């Protein structure tokens, strides 16, 4: 499992100066989705 935190004020797209508040759902939310790909970076080479 991945422990998860919940957040309501979202600084969408880093548009600093504006933010969205997400009102709460009625309750008991469960969802599922498909993982189809990953965004990865490689550690850059060090000065070794």
């Amino acid at each position: 499992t991945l422990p998860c935190r919940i957040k309501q004020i979202i600084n969408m797209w880093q548009k600093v100066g504006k933010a969205m508040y997400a009102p709460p759902i009625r309750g008991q939310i469960r969802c599922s989705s498909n993982i189809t790909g990953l965004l990865l970076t490689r550690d850059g080479g060090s000065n070794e």
Binding site: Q28, R30, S32
Partner: protein, 120 residues
């Protein structure tokens, strides 16, 4: 460790509609399917139907024209609606967890059972 709380109409007049609800306290509705089983000892345990998260259902064909099932996922509720109730529908109505065929093909976590009487 799945729990169930159930309640509903335990007394109906003939030709009325039965409404029974079970609350699920641990999971979603596609982890296992929920089904309704009615005890009426001459027939043992009679299957009424089962319903999944997606609203997919399988009904006992003899009740196809009388029974409706639905799931309210936000309230974690399994709901059975049976129209035109008769004396033959008197019995104990259980919500049961249905495991996958390939896993166990078995019925567990039975609720205590709603006691439903149909009478004048």
């Amino acid at each position: 460790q799945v729990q169930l709380q159930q309640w509903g109409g335990g007394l109906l007049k003939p030709s009325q509609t039965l409404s029974l609800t079970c609350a699920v306290y641990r999971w979603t509705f596609n982890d296992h399917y929920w089904s309704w089983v009615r005890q009426s000892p001459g027939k043992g345990l009679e299957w009424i139907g089962e319903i999944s998260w997606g609203g997919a259902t399988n009904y006992n064909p003899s009740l196809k024209s009388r029974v409706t099932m639905s799931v309210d996922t936000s309230m974690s509720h399994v709901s059975l609606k049976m129209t035109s109730v008769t004396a033959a529908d008197t019995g104990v109505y259980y919500c049961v967890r249905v495991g996958p065929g390939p896993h166990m093909a078995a019925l567990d976590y039975w609720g205590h059972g709603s006691r439903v009487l149909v009478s004048s």
